[PDB]
Structure formats: structure tokens, C-alpha cells
Design a protein around this ligand. Structure first.
Ligand SMILES: [Mg+2]
Ligand SMILES: [Mg+2]
Ligand SMILES: [Mg+2]
Ligand SMILES: [Mg+2]
Ligand SMILES: [Mg+2]
Ligand SMILES: [Mg+2]
Ligand SMILES: [Mg+2]
Ligand SMILES: [Mg+2]
Ligand SMILES: [Mg+2]
Ligand SMILES: [Mg+2]
Ligand SMILES: [Mg+2]
Ligand SMILES: [Mg+2]
Ligand SMILES: [Mg+2]
Ligand SMILES: [Mg+2]
Ligand SMILES: [Mg+2]
Ligand SMILES: [Mg+2]
Ligand SMILES: [Mg+2]
Ligand SMILES: [Mg+2]
Ligand SMILES: [Mg+2]
Ligand SMILES: [Mg+2]
Ligand SMILES: [Mg+2]
Ligand SMILES: [Mg+2]
Ligand SMILES: [Mg+2]
Ligand SMILES: [Mg+2]
Ligand SMILES: [Mg+2]
Ligand SMILES: [Mg+2]
Ligand SMILES: [Mg+2]
Ligand SMILES: [Mg+2]
Ligand SMILES: [Mg+2]
Ligand SMILES: [Mg+2]
Ligand SMILES: [Mg+2]
Ligand SMILES: [Mg+2]
Ligand SMILES: [Mg+2]
Ligand SMILES: [Mg+2]
Ligand SMILES: [Mg+2]
Ligand SMILES: [Mg+2]
Ligand SMILES: [Mg+2]
Ligand SMILES: [Mg+2]
Ligand SMILES: [Mg+2]
Ligand SMILES: [Mg+2]
Ligand SMILES: [Mg+2]
Ligand SMILES: [Mg+2]
Ligand SMILES: [Mg+2]
Ligand SMILES: [Mg+2]
Ligand SMILES: [Mg+2]
Ligand SMILES: [Mg+2]
Ligand SMILES: [Mg+2]
Ligand SMILES: [Mg+2]
Ligand SMILES: [Mg+2]
Ligand SMILES: [Mg+2]
Ligand SMILES: [Mg+2]
Ligand SMILES: [Mg+2]
Ligand SMILES: [Mg+2]
Ligand SMILES: [Mg+2]
Ligand SMILES: [Mg+2]
Ligand SMILES: [Mg+2]
Ligand SMILES: [Mg+2]
Ligand SMILES: [Mg+2]
Ligand SMILES: [Mg+2]
Ligand SMILES: [Mg+2]
Ligand SMILES: [Mg+2]
Ligand SMILES: [Mg+2]
Ligand SMILES: [Mg+2]
Ligand SMILES: [Mg+2]
Ligand SMILES: [Mg+2]
Ligand SMILES: [Mg+2]
Ligand SMILES: [Mg+2]
Ligand SMILES: [Mg+2]
Ligand SMILES: [Mg+2]
Ligand SMILES: [Mg+2]
Ligand SMILES: [Mg+2]
Ligand SMILES: [Mg+2]
Ligand SMILES: [Mg+2]
Ligand SMILES: [Mg+2]
Ligand SMILES: [Mg+2]
Ligand SMILES: [Mg+2]
Ligand SMILES: [Mg+2]
Ligand SMILES: [Mg+2]
Ligand SMILES: [Mg+2]
Ligand SMILES: [Mg+2]
Ligand SMILES: [Mg+2]
Ligand SMILES: [Mg+2]
Ligand SMILES: [Mg+2]
Ligand SMILES: [Mg+2]
Ligand SMILES: [Mg+2]
Ligand SMILES: [Mg+2]
Ligand SMILES: [Mg+2]
Ligand SMILES: [Mg+2]
Ligand SMILES: [Mg+2]
Ligand SMILES: [Mg+2]
Ligand SMILES: [Mg+2]
Ligand SMILES: [Mg+2]
Ligand SMILES: [Mg+2]
Ligand SMILES: [Mg+2]
Lengths: 51, 193, 203, 148, 99
RNA sequence: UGACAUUGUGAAGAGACAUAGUUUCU
RNA sequence: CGGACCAAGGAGUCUAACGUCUAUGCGAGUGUUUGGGUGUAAAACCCAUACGCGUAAUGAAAGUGAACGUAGGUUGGGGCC
RNA sequence: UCUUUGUAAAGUGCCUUCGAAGAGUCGAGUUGUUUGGGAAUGCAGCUCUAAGUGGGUGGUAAAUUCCAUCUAAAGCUAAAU
RNA sequence: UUGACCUCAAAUCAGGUAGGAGUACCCGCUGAACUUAAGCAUAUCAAUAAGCGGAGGAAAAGAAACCAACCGGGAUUGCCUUAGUAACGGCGAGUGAAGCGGCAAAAGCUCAAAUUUGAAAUCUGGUACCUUCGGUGCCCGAGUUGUAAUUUGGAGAGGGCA
């Protein structure tokens, strides 16, 4: 009966994931994260819906 | 074990409680299991729709009578008035409550019209064979939602006959308070020889 | 019908006719064995209203159980413990003699299912009961959609689990605010209200 | 988490921060609320005056709900109207057409009068008013309509 | 009834257009029936009176419907079953050892 | 040790409606 | 007083309910996770009705229930003009 | 797909007469136990023991008058647990 | 003398059933003390452990002698809540439910008491055949001290009419 799961406020949760989306642009953070992206067209990387 | 300026707590842990701890580890389990259970009932139940038709009902007590709320079943009166029998209404996915009684006309017309619309929006396959596949609507509750009865209009003319409302309340309160006494003044007085 | 007359007569146990019978009957039962099989119901109107039937596979059994308090055994009265538990002598047992009566016959006739039982008589030592049982292997019952529920395995020794009428009584099983403690089944409900329930997302 | 806990920091010093004279024994004061009339009374009077003894009446089988009666002040009140609809009635305050507010529909039981509402006529349906609440409504040209 | 329409006071409540439903037999569970009049009446004269009922009609004829009630209250359970038991004894007396 | 229940049938004697016999005790 | 010697075990934990403090979300509100929806399936994503705490107090109770006034006067007040 | 089970069985409208409904039980005193249940929450023992416009319940004992609400002392029964 | 009836016996009589195990969970019985109260007897631990009887895949509960007091609700069970509250308590230590509301699942019924009385209409067993979880014929037997149809309070029954 140790606490295993954790409650996060639904709204704080969105803020977090919103922020995480926001920084998927920002070339530098992506590079800083691993992610070999020096040779890609642009950021964000939008691709054809045919994918 | 009394110290500091702390609120006095009441943590009832003096029986062998560690023996009776229920961790709902199977919470996700039992939801998966409940979803599958309904997906089987859906398929067993042919195009029939998982639930029965429930009536409108006014919730009891001074705290919940504002709201209206699905009741158990439709009373023998409403069923008849809506033109079918108890015995048969059951086989047509209509819940009937032999215990509920009708004292309010509004609710009564409400449920009898609720039964009209139910009948008009279903189809009952023949006993024969055919079984003209007609795909299940899954609820019925969703199909025939229960809505709160509208009680008035947004705006209207201010009528002030001039009587305090507050003082109407005090007076009505008082009249009840001295009702039995003022009756002891009518029995002792009509007794006067 | 003659049944309605018998029923009403039986509510007159202080009437000269009825206590002639009860005094002569109670003497006879005390000469037979404490458990003895009954020829026929001696209250056919009571039996038949508790579920009895006059067809092969319905048994009646008559049983004698002593009266009074349950003397806590306990050698020499010696209790060993606090004074609240020192009682030996006004302790009373939470089951009625009716339950004791059914239970002792139901063991005697293991192959029978005890359906119900009714009181018949009593003196200063003994209460006397007649117990109505059903043979769940007798085809007369195994057929018979009305009584064949008894043949299910969930009704073995229903008299030792408090499921006859008297069992449900002493088990306190009735709806209402007067029965909160014992109603879904006292130990069950105790255990419930004494369960600590923690969710994954603690509330 | 355990890595920030002060007992990690206490490792290596004899007593775990619990003193060499005074130790950390089992229950020195006794368990729980023991001795609130005796060795612990200084702490019960102050911090907890009023703790011992009885007051008022018993009430067998009280059902809260009987006493359900949330309160709302003129203070708010205009908030029970949606904000778009609100400005429509704030302007064009008249008899003939004045908003009806079913404050029981909003789940309130009584209207108190905490203070000052614009001079717009409002028709207030409610179960209970306070003398002031009801008077202050009228000064704006509204009425109270006792409901149930 | 008819509720006044306000939240306190005498007939306190919401005004609602009424209905008064159809009546339930389960409300008539105690009612007589000629079948039960006949049989109880025919039984009474077969088995007669009981020891405490004899002491009850002699107690009326020589002490009245108050000491009878008092002792009947202790004999049965209640003052109310005793009220009704005395009356039964009055009508045992009147209808029999009189007209 | 007392009361009530098991507990019934006679007879003599006391005891009341207040000196017809339903009832109660020796 | 314990300790001949060496290795390996070896003691402020977890839980229910709380006080202060702090960080964060939203704010007269707030809390998705009993449940439903959904899913790449104990995850993540979504959500209706309630409920809980907060928005009113005070009396044992029946009850009543917060603007004389720019929501007061006086004195000190950072800041600003 | 073969037997037609049937001169069978059931549903409904109106008029009339009825309308059976569980006892050593309900209940009451006392004793013990138990319960948050408090002039007594259940249960059991012994004594007393009903009624039929009756009976039970209506969380402060009693007397009177009303009102609300179910229908005990027999019974079966899937799921959610 | 012969044949019944009632009650009671006996068979290596025809066919069957019970025991014992296990027991996590379930229905009951029975029942402590350590402990807590800074001592201790009421209380607490605990209607817990140990002991005893009885079941199932679940058990039990269950179609209101219910909740209420409302504009009333409407079998049971379980969750969220009501609530560490109403209340109990050397009113100390401690204890402590229920109604309403949301939700999961949903489902309902049958006896007794009735004259079939122009027909015991009912049923176990044996036996032969068959299309063998069973049907038919026949024969013993059960059963009127009542086996079936009908009815179950929500009703319902006998008449009469459509
Ligand atoms: Mg958070
Ligand atoms: Mg301090
Ligand atoms: Mg706890
Ligand atoms: Mg302890
Ligand atoms: Mg588990
Ligand atoms: Mg599961
Ligand atoms: Mg469903
Ligand atoms: Mg209503
Ligand atoms: Mg309600
Ligand atoms: Mg077909
Ligand atoms: Mg009688
Ligand atoms: Mg026989
Ligand atoms: Mg000892
Ligand atoms: Mg003790
Ligand atoms: Mg004897
Ligand atoms: Mg309890
Ligand atoms: Mg239980
Ligand atoms: Mg129990
Ligand atoms: Mg969770
Ligand atoms: Mg937490
Ligand atoms: Mg760590
Ligand atoms: Mg560290
Ligand atoms: Mg340090
Ligand atoms: Mg260190
Ligand atoms: Mg320290
Ligand atoms: Mg120190
Ligand atoms: Mg030290
Ligand atoms: Mg020192
Ligand atoms: Mg010191
Ligand atoms: Mg002190
Ligand atoms: Mg206190
Ligand atoms: Mg008090
Ligand atoms: Mg009070
Ligand atoms: Mg005021
Ligand atoms: Mg003597
Ligand atoms: Mg004799
Ligand atoms: Mg030393
Ligand atoms: Mg040494
Ligand atoms: Mg250690
Ligand atoms: Mg810690
Ligand atoms: Mg913040
Ligand atoms: Mg608000
Ligand atoms: Mg989740
Ligand atoms: Mg996905
Ligand atoms: Mg999974
Ligand atoms: Mg989605
Ligand atoms: Mg919803
Ligand atoms: Mg809220
Ligand atoms: Mg609150
Ligand atoms: Mg506060
Ligand atoms: Mg405010
Ligand atoms: Mg105040
Ligand atoms: Mg208040
Ligand atoms: Mg006043
Ligand atoms: Mg003033
Ligand atoms: Mg003034
Ligand atoms: Mg001054
Ligand atoms: Mg009944
Ligand atoms: Mg006594
Ligand atoms: Mg006990
Ligand atoms: Mg009391
Ligand atoms: Mg008691
Ligand atoms: Mg009544
Ligand atoms: Mg009374
Ligand atoms: Mg009702
Ligand atoms: Mg049965
Ligand atoms: Mg059952
Ligand atoms: Mg043999
Ligand atoms: Mg066994
Ligand atoms: Mg066992
Ligand atoms: Mg014990
Ligand atoms: Mg002991
Ligand atoms: Mg211990
Ligand atoms: Mg203590
Ligand atoms: Mg101690
Ligand atoms: Mg100590
Ligand atoms: Mg000691
Ligand atoms: Mg304790
Ligand atoms: Mg105890
Ligand atoms: Mg325990
Ligand atoms: Mg055990
Ligand atoms: Mg099963
Ligand atoms: Mg098995
Ligand atoms: Mg299951
Ligand atoms: Mg019923
Ligand atoms: Mg319910
Ligand atoms: Mg409290
Ligand atoms: Mg306390
Ligand atoms: Mg306890
Ligand atoms: Mg508790
Ligand atoms: Mg609900
Ligand atoms: Mg069924
Ligand atoms: Mg018919
Ligand atoms: Mg029949």
C-alpha cells in the first residue's frame, strides 16, 4: 500500500505537454536532446499527409 | 503524547487494520473487464439496447426535489395510460415499477409522453423468423434523455402587491407555532358552560 | 375448507379443548425418543403453509430440545480473565431452540434437506418441534419445478448456516434502520466498514 | 524521497539527533490523548480550551439535508445571470420586463443582504429571504417571490 | 392537503396539480371478510373462553371497565390491545347473558 | 430461600360482588 | 560496562489524517483517474452528473444573518504625483 | 426442414357480487448479550401473550386525537461484490 | 374364521443418499488475553485470535411489515460520498453508523389460505416396447388427514355483457 501512482492536476499536466510541444520546434533543444537534425529542411518538420 | 498547538486528530488505527487494506491495483483491470463484459452483452442481446427505459421522477427531500431524475419503472397507471400492459411493456425494454404511485399530474403526463416517444422510435421484430437485421442503438437512456423541466420565462413584469415576503415567512412560521395552543383556547372556551 | 378452521382453533391454546390435547400429546412425545420420525404432520395446516406437501419425498421428524439458559461450560465456573467475562449463569445463546431442533435432526437425516420447522408443544424441560424435510434425490421432487430448487448443492444443511426461517431470524436479516448492524450479514458488513480502501490515485 | 531525508544526514552520529541524555524511548507521555486532565493539561487549556465536558442538546438521528439551505448575498446575485444576458438587463431596467432569477434553480436556499446591487428591477424567486435582502431588492424596484 | 406554496408554515410545499392514485389492496390486509367472521365466530363457541378471559368478565361485572383494563393491560401487552379486549368481553356479556 | 412455569381431580374449612357460588389459599 | 580477531548481514521505515513553510496549476473558485469514453492497453489522451473543500456568521436551540458614511475617523507607513 | 400441438391456452373493455392473505407468533415484562441506537439497536432465555377499519414502522418514556408509510410471523432468484 | 386400517418393527429386501478432505474468499456458533487508558475494575484491543458446525464458484442479500416527511423515492449487492459526522463513552482513553446524491450491475417472481366435485384432472416405482438426460401402454403403490389446474395483494376470483 505504498503510494505507487501520482496525481497531477489535469491542467498543470496540459501546461507541461503544451510546453513540451512548444519546444519540439526550437532547433537547439532538439539538438541538445540527442537528435541528429543538422541536415533537415526546417523545424518544425511538416511532411505530406501521404505519409 | 499531547504537545504543540496541533489539531486533535482521530486516526482510528487501533484494530488489526493492516489485515483489511484494499489496494485497487485491479482498477485498470476491472475497467477492461467491464468494457469487455458489455461488449459481450451487446452482442448477445441482438439489436436490443443494453438498458431499459426509465421514467422521470422527482427526487425526494427538501434538498433534491428541485432536480428530476430517472426512476426505477413506469407505474401500472402510466403504462396503461400510454396504452399497453405491464406484462408486455417488459418484453419491449420498458421498466415497470409496481411500487411507484402517481400523485403529480405533471410527472404523469411526462412519463406517458415519454412512453409514446419510446414506442414511436423503436421497432419490434416479429415472433416468426426473418429477424430483419436493424443494428443496435446501444443505450436508450441516451436516445430518450431526461431533461430538467423549465419553470418560467427570462423576464416578466414586476408585480409588487406590497407584502414583505420576509414577513409572510415569519407570519406563516408563527401561525404554525401557536396553532395547537390556539386550539386549546377553542376547546377551553367552547367548554364555557 | 377445513384448513382455515384448524388455523383459527390453534390460536386458542388456553382453551379447554386445546389444553386437553396438549397435555396428552406432550406426555406421548416424551415417551418416544428425543428424535423420532413422525407418521404425519400433527398440525397439517401449519406444515402445509410452511411448504409441506403430502407426497412421496416429504418427511416429518419430531424433536425434543431442553429449555433454559446456556450454562457456559468452563470447569468449576472458573473463567480466567476480566470480571466482565466472569459470567457463567445468565448466558443465553444466540440461536433459538428451534434452530437446535432442526440442526440435530438434519444431521440425523443427512440425505434430507431441512425445509422448515414448527413448534408443537412444551413442558418445563423440553420444547417439542416438528421439522419438515424434503428428499432432493426423490424423482417426485427432482422433477416438480416448484420444490426442485432445494436439490441444488447450495442448500446443503441450510439449517446449519442459518438459512431456514429461524436462522434468518436470529441472524437478524430484515430491511430497515432497526437492522443496520445485521442485514447484509453482520460479519460481512462489519468487515466492510472496517476495510481501508486505497486507490491508485489516492483521494 | 529518501535521499533528501534528514536521517541520511544523521548517519555516523551516535544518537540520530535524538539526544544522549533524553534518548528516544517508546511512549514517554503515554499513548495518544492520555492524561489530558493530568500531565498534559497545560497544553489542553490553551490550544484546546473547551475540550472536556458537555454543552447543548442531543439530537438522535439528525439528517443533515433537513437543514439544507445554502446562502447567497445580494453581494453576488446578479452572478446567477449569464454574463452576456447580464448586461442586457442591467441596461433597460424596468418593470414590464425584468429578469427572473430562480435562486433555488441555482441551488441556494436563502438570500442574505451583504450589500448594494445596481438599481435594476429584478424578480427574485427564493425560499427564504432576510429582511434586508428583501428590502434592498425593492429599493431597486424588484420583488421577492416566495417559492418551494 | 393542498400545499400553501411557501417554504415554511402550515401546509408548506410546492403547489402541484394533484392526482390521488388508484387504491392498493395491500392497504386492506386487516379487513374483515365474511369468511373470517364466520370461522372465528364458529370457533369461539366451540373452544369457549380462556382462564384469563373468565377472570376478565367477572372482573368487569364486579369492578368495571377500568380495573378490567388495568389487569388486561398487564395480561396482554398493551393498553390498546386491552382496550379492545375489554370491549370484546363487554360484547361477550351483553349479547349472551342478557338479550 | 422466595416467586412464576411444569400443575391436574376430590372433600372439609377460611376468604369477596356485600349470607345464592365462578374464584383464591390452609 | 561492551569489545580476542576478520568478513558478510545489521537500526527513524511505510501508511491514514494533520501543523508550519516552500515550489507549481488555476482562482471565487478548485479537485480528469468512483465512473464513462478511448487506446500502440495497468501507460498516455478525453469527459457527463454529482461530491468534497472554499465562498457566512452566530446561538444549547427555535432562529436570525453583515455599507450612517467615497466600506468611516485618527496616527505612523513604502511607493507614486 | 418434419410434425400442427387445438373443438387447446393467453391478452384486453364494461357491469355485478366478492375479495380468503401465515400464532406460543406479533407484542409485553424481566434477564443476559450486543449495537452509534441514547427511558433500551439487534439477538436469545424464562413468564405473559394479541388482533382484523387489524398489524408493524415513524431514532425521548406516558395518556388522548390525528397523519404518513409499508403488509411480518412461509419461499426462489442472474449480474455488478 | 377371514380381510382391512392405524401405529411400530425386521431383512446381505429394490434403488439411492450422508460421512472425509480442503477451507484464500463465504453462512453461522463460540470466544480470550497481551494491549491502550501513562495505575486500574467500566471501556479498549475485539463483536478480533484460538475452538466448533456448514456451503459455493462465489457465498450471502434480495422484489419492502423499506426509505422517508419530499413536488416524495421504490428488490438486493458493491463503489464514490454522506463522516471521523448524528450518536455511544470512568462523556475519559477511545469509539462510531444511516437516509438522500453520482456511479457499477440490473430482473424478476411462488406458496399457504378456494368445491375439480359432471367425475385425483396429480405422482414414485415395476414391467414391455421405443426414436433412452426422456415417451407410450399396462400393473402394484402414493395421495382425499388433499396430489393437479386456477389465484398471490402489483392483486385476484364467481357471475353477466361486448
Ligand atoms: Mg500538480
Ligand atoms: Mg507549546
Ligand atoms: Mg480505519
Ligand atoms: Mg492496540
Ligand atoms: Mg486482491
Ligand atoms: Mg478485472
Ligand atoms: Mg447497464
Ligand atoms: Mg413528483
Ligand atoms: Mg433526493
Ligand atoms: Mg427464426
Ligand atoms: Mg386467541
Ligand atoms: Mg409415507
Ligand atoms: Mg486470567
Ligand atoms: Mg474490560
Ligand atoms: Mg417435566
Ligand atoms: Mg455497528
Ligand atoms: Mg456476515
Ligand atoms: Mg455475522
Ligand atoms: Mg486510482
Ligand atoms: Mg495525498
Ligand atoms: Mg532517494
Ligand atoms: Mg544525500
Ligand atoms: Mg547533521
Ligand atoms: Mg556524518
Ligand atoms: Mg531531532
Ligand atoms: Mg543529549
Ligand atoms: Mg544513546
Ligand atoms: Mg545528563
Ligand atoms: Mg533526565
Ligand atoms: Mg501540562
Ligand atoms: Mg471529548
Ligand atoms: Mg442531551
Ligand atoms: Mg434536539
Ligand atoms: Mg437582514
Ligand atoms: Mg413452597
Ligand atoms: Mg388430573
Ligand atoms: Mg550498565
Ligand atoms: Mg569483556
Ligand atoms: Mg538493528
Ligand atoms: Mg518519513
Ligand atoms: Mg500558485
Ligand atoms: Mg462561487
Ligand atoms: Mg489512469
Ligand atoms: Mg494511442
Ligand atoms: Mg490492460
Ligand atoms: Mg479522445
Ligand atoms: Mg452522465
Ligand atoms: Mg464543487
Ligand atoms: Mg459545507
Ligand atoms: Mg471557515
Ligand atoms: Mg460573499
Ligand atoms: Mg454572525
Ligand atoms: Mg445554523
Ligand atoms: Mg423568534
Ligand atoms: Mg446606524
Ligand atoms: Mg439603522
Ligand atoms: Mg480622534
Ligand atoms: Mg404474510
Ligand atoms: Mg416477570
Ligand atoms: Mg457471545
Ligand atoms: Mg430512550
Ligand atoms: Mg438490549
Ligand atoms: Mg398504521
Ligand atoms: Mg405512543
Ligand atoms: Mg410512498
Ligand atoms: Mg417453496
Ligand atoms: Mg435465498
Ligand atoms: Mg439392499
Ligand atoms: Mg465436513
Ligand atoms: Mg469453518
Ligand atoms: Mg468475545
Ligand atoms: Mg478467558
Ligand atoms: Mg498487540
Ligand atoms: Mg484507552
Ligand atoms: Mg494500561
Ligand atoms: Mg505504561
Ligand atoms: Mg498492570
Ligand atoms: Mg479503541
Ligand atoms: Mg464489546
Ligand atoms: Mg481484526
Ligand atoms: Mg477463527
Ligand atoms: Mg452456483
Ligand atoms: Mg466444489
Ligand atoms: Mg460473478
Ligand atoms: Mg410483495
Ligand atoms: Mg433501494
Ligand atoms: Mg462526533
Ligand atoms: Mg475523542
Ligand atoms: Mg466496537
Ligand atoms: Mg468506526
Ligand atoms: Mg443513486
Ligand atoms: Mg426470474
Ligand atoms: Mg387467467
Ligand atoms: Mg394450489
Amino acid at each position: 500500500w505504498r503510494k505507487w501512482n501520482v496525481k497531477v492536476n489535469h491542467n498543470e499536466k496540459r501546461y507541461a505537454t503544451a510546453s513540451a510541444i512548444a519546444a519540439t520546434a526550437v532547433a537547439s533543444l532538439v539538438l541538445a536532446r540527442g537528435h541528429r537534425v543538422e541536415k533537415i529542411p526546417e523545424i518544425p518538420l511538416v511532411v505530406s499527409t501521404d505519409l | 503524547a499531547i504537545s504543540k498547538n496541533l489539531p486533535i486528530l482521530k486516526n482510528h488505527f487501533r484494530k488489526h487494520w493492516q489485515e483489511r487494506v484494499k489496494v485497487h491495483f485491479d482498477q485498470a483491470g476491472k475497467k477492461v473487464s467491464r468494457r469487455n463484459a458489455r461488449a459481450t452483452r451487446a452482442a448477445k442481446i441482438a439489436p436490443r439496447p443494453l438498458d431499459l427505459l426509465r421514467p422521470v421522477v422527482r427526487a425526494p427531500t427538501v434538498k433534491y426535489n428541485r432536480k428530476v431524475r430517472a426512476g426505477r419503472g413506469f407505474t401500472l397507471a402510466e403504462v396503461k395510460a400510454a396504452g399497453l400492459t405491464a406484462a408486455y411493456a417488459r418484453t419491449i425494454g420498458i421498466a415497470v415499477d409496481h411500487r411507484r404511485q402517481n400523485r403529480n399530474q405533471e410527472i404523469f403526463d411526462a412519463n406517458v409522453q415519454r412512453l409514446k416517444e419510446y414506442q414511436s422510435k423503436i421497432i419490434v421484430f416479429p415472433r416468426n423468423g426473418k429477424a430483419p437485421e436493424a443494428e443496435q442503438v446501444l443505450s436508450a437512456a441516451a436516445t430518450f434523455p431526461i431533461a430538467q423541466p423549465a419553470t418560467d420565462v427570462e423576464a416578466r413584469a414586476v408585480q409588487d402587491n406590497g407584502e414583505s415576503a420576509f414577513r409572510t415567512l415569519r407570519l406563516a412560521r408563527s401561525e404554525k407555532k401557536f396553532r395547537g395552543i390556539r386550539e386549546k383556547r377553542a376547546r377551553e372556551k367552547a367548554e364555557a358552560e | 375448507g377445513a384448513y382455515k378452521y384448524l388455523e383459527e382453533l390453534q390460536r386458542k391454546k388456553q382453551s379447554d379443548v386445546l389444553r386437553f390435547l396438549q397435555r396428552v400429546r406432550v406426555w406421548e412425545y416424551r415417551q418416544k425418543n428425543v428424535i423420532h420420525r413422525a407418521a404425519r404432520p400433527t398440525r397439517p395446516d401449519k406444515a402445509r403453509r410452511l411448504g409441506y406437501k403430502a407426497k412421496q419425498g416429504f418427511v416429518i421428524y419430531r424433536v425434543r430440545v431442553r429449555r433454559g439458559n446456556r450454562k457456559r461450560p468452563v470447569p468449576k465456573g472458573a473463567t480466567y480473565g476480566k470480571p466482565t467475562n466472569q459470567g457463567v449463569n445468565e448466558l443465553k445463546y444466540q440461536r433459538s431452540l428451534r434452530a437446535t431442533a432442526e440442526e440435530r435432526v438434519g444431521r440425523r437425516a443427512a440425505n434430507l434437506r431441512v425445509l422448515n420447522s414448527y413448534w408443537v408443544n412444551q413442558d418445563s424441560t423440553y420444547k417439542y418441534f416438528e421439522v419438515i424435510l424434503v428428499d432432493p434425490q426423490h424423482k417426485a421432487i427432482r422433477r416438480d419445478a416448484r420444490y426442485n430448487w432445494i436439490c441444488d448443492p447450495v442448500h446443503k444443511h441450510r439449517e446449519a448456516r442459518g438459512l431456514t426461517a429461524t436462522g434468518k431470524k436470529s441472524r437478524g436479516i430484515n430491511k430497515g434502520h432497526k437492522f443496520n448492524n445485521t442485514k447484509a450479514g453482520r460479519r460481512k458488513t462489519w468487515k466492510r466498514q472496517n476495510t481501508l480502501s486505497l486507490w491508485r490515485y489516492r483521494k | 524521497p529518501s535521499r533528501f531525508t534528514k536521517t541520511r544526514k544523521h548517519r555516523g552520529h551516535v544518537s540520530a539527533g535524538k539526544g544522549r541524555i533524553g534518548k528516544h524511548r517508546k511512549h514517554p507521555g503515554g499513548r495518544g490523548m492520555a492524561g489530558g486532565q493530568h500531565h498534559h493539561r497545560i497544553n489542553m487549556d490553551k490550544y484546546h480550551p473547551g475540550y472536556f465536558g458537555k454543552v447543548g442538546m442531543r439530537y438522535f438521528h439528525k439528517q443533515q439535508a433537513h437543514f439544507w439551505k445554502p446562502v447567497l448575498n445580494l453581494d453576488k446575485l446578479w452572478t446567477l445571470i449569464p454574463e452576456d444576458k447580464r448586461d442586457q438587463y442591467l441596461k433597460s431596467a424596468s418593470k414590464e420586463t425584468a429578469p427572473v432569477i430562480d435562486t433555488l434553480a441555482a441551488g441556494y436556499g436563502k438570500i442574505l443582504g451583504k450589500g448594494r446591487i445596481p438599481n435594476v428591477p429584478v424578480i427574485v424567486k427564493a425560499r427564504f429571504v432576510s429582511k434586508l435582502a428583501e428590502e434592498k431588492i425593492r429599493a431597486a424596484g424588484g420583488v421577492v417571490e416566495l417559492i418551494a | 392537503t393542498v400545499k400553501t406554496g411557501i417554504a415554511i408554515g402550515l401546509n408548506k410545499g410546492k403547489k402541484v396539480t394533484s392526482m390521488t392514485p388508484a387504491p392498493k389492496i395491500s392497504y386492506k390486509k386487516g379487513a374483515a371478510s365474511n369468511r373470517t367472521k364466520f370461522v372465528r365466530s364458529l370457533v369461539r363457541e366451540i373452544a369457549g373462553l380462556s382462564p384469563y378471559e373468565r377472570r376478565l368478565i367477572d372482573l368487569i361485572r364486579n369492578s368495571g371497565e377500568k380495573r378490567a383494563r388495568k389487569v388486561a393491560k398487564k395480561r396482554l401487552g398493551s393498553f390498546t390491545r386491552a382496550k379492545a379486549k375489554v370491549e370484546e368481553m363487554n360484547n361477550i356479556i351483553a349479547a349472551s347473558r342478557r338479550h
